Design an enzyme around this catalytic site. Structure first.
Site: not given
Ligand SMILES: Cc1cc2nc3c(=O)[nH]c(=O)nc-3n(C[C@H](O)[C@H](O)[C@H](O)COP(=O)(O)O)c2cc1C
Ligand SMILES: Cc1cc2nc3c(=O)[nH]c(=O)nc-3n(C[C@H](O)[C@H](O)[C@H](O)COP(=O)(O)O)c2cc1C
Ligand SMILES: O=C1Oc2ccccc2C(=O)[C@@H]1C[C@H]1C(=O)Oc2ccccc2C1=O
Lengths: 217, 216
Positions: B73, B13, B164
């Site tokens: 970020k 984050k 996203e």
């Molecule tokens: C395609 C995609 C879009 C995401 N968009 C965001 C976002 O805009 N902001 C954010 O804080 N996390 C975002 N995430 C992170 C997800 O919240 C995270 O992948 C999920 O909670 C699982 O946690 P991890 O990646 O630590 O395993 C995104 C993940 C993916 C795969």
């Protein structure tokens, strides 16, 4: 070695050896790979069918008919066959199951942070459900992210694999009853070990150059 | 071991501005983008890698309105890759792909070159005329790339976050992507996390396999 070595050396296998099985541990490790893939907001909008028996792979292989007969052999001869499925609609019961699992795994200290992550999930879910009308496509996009994660992962376990789009989705959906369960089949991935009949094992890997596909700013 | 890095990777984050990718890692990131698989080897993608502070500020303009919390970020991370998809699958791209497969020596005969261009065109024509989903088919392949990329950078020892939460219409206009024939889908900052990141020590959460997985 390193993952760049694995990324440059992995390939789409065109023929499998049916006698070469996943080890008991690799069979568990491929399931861990499926589950622990990231998704947007942790929405996890997926189901997996993992076929490891002759009956279960024959039931998957019903989908490779008609135009798609060149994919039958891979589905039957691989050790394990993974069917990657998306949800048909993003529902509130499932959005709740995700928040309540995050709670039970201890990710929120305060009950205000539980509500702030449910609201953040809802803002994304409602953007795709109510406004843009593309929630089926958004969820499918996450399943494809999972396939990508899975393909490099199994290659790093020293396993061979091939992603298949060349199958009948209506036939596979009907065989496992996916529509009433709320799912659609998207990618079939046979995993195992290649045979000597895999002509793609020894062929060079081809990609477009970076001066077409990549801009540096 | 790859299971260790799948279980240990996190969405970060907050990033450290002073921790940069090595020249080796900067090259390895581009290699992972290039060598991801796609349906028919269609490779229906463009990548923008922002490593200068001016480049990262142009990317961060997409997270201005609804998404102010995502700007930090995009600015602080060493490298920021925007994953882009093709808007239409044209015949110039289909010929670019098969000619590259030819120059790399994948065909024994000019007949097998023709049979691969035919086998690609069958799948490409199915998606625009019949199933009316060519844009999302190509967008799916780019999302497959993101999945490959995220595990790849995790195994290089690097922190990543997929985003996203940006305005695709602002990003598209900033880099001129619409007239080039591309659309922005995912932004992925790559780097190392700062010493104030709360997600790094926090447990992972996924749904259990008895919900998500059937064995047959
Ligand atoms: C395609 C995609 C879009 C995401 N968009 C965001 C976002 O805009 N902001 C954010 O804080 N996390 C975002 N995430 C992170 C997800 O919240 C995270 O992948 C999920 O909670 C699982 O946690 P991890 O990646 O630590 O395993 C995104 C993940 C993916 C795969
Ligand atoms: C989503 C997807 C669908 C694919 N479908 C098939 C298929 O039906 N049959 C097949 O033999 N290969 C299939 N492939 C393999 C591609 O042809 C292959 O990934 C591409 O040519 C690049 O080669 P590589 O995987 O060996 O690097 C598919 C790839 C992806 C990512
Ligand atoms: O190389 C391919 O990649 C694909 C990517 C996405 C969708 C469809 C295809 C194909 O039909 C083929 C052709 C292809 C072929 O010409 O011969 C084979 C022989 C044995 C096993 C498999 C094959 C193939 O898949």
């Amino acid at each position: 070695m390193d993952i760049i070595s694995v990324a440059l050396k992995r390939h789409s296998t065109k023929a499998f050896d049916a006698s070469k099985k996943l080890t008991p541990e690799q069979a568990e490790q491929i399931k861990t790979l499926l589950q622990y893939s990231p998704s947007s907001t942790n929405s996890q909008p997926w189901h997996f069918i993992v076929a490891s028996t002759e009956e279960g792979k024959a039931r998957v292989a019903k989908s490779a008919a008609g135009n798609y007969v060149f994919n039958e052999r891979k589905m039957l001869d691989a050790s394990h066959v993974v069917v990657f499925c998306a949800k048909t609609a993003m529902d509130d019961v499932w959005l709740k199951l995700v928040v309540d699992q995050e709670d039970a795994d201890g990710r929120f200290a305060t009950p205000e942070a539980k509500a702030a992550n449910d609201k953040g999930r809802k803002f994304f879910a409602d953007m795709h459900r109510k406004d843009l009308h593309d929630d089926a496509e958004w969820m499918a996009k996450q399943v494809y992210l999972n396939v990508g994660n899975f393909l490099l992962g199994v290659a790093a376990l020293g396993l061979d694999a091939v992603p298949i789009e060349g199958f009948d989705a209506a036939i596979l959906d009907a065989e496992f009853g996916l529509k009433e369960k709320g799912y659609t089949s998207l990618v079939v991935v046979p995993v195992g070990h290649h045979s000597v009949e895999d002509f793609n094992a020894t062929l060079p890997k081809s990609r477009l150059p970076q001066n077409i596909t990549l801009t540096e700013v």
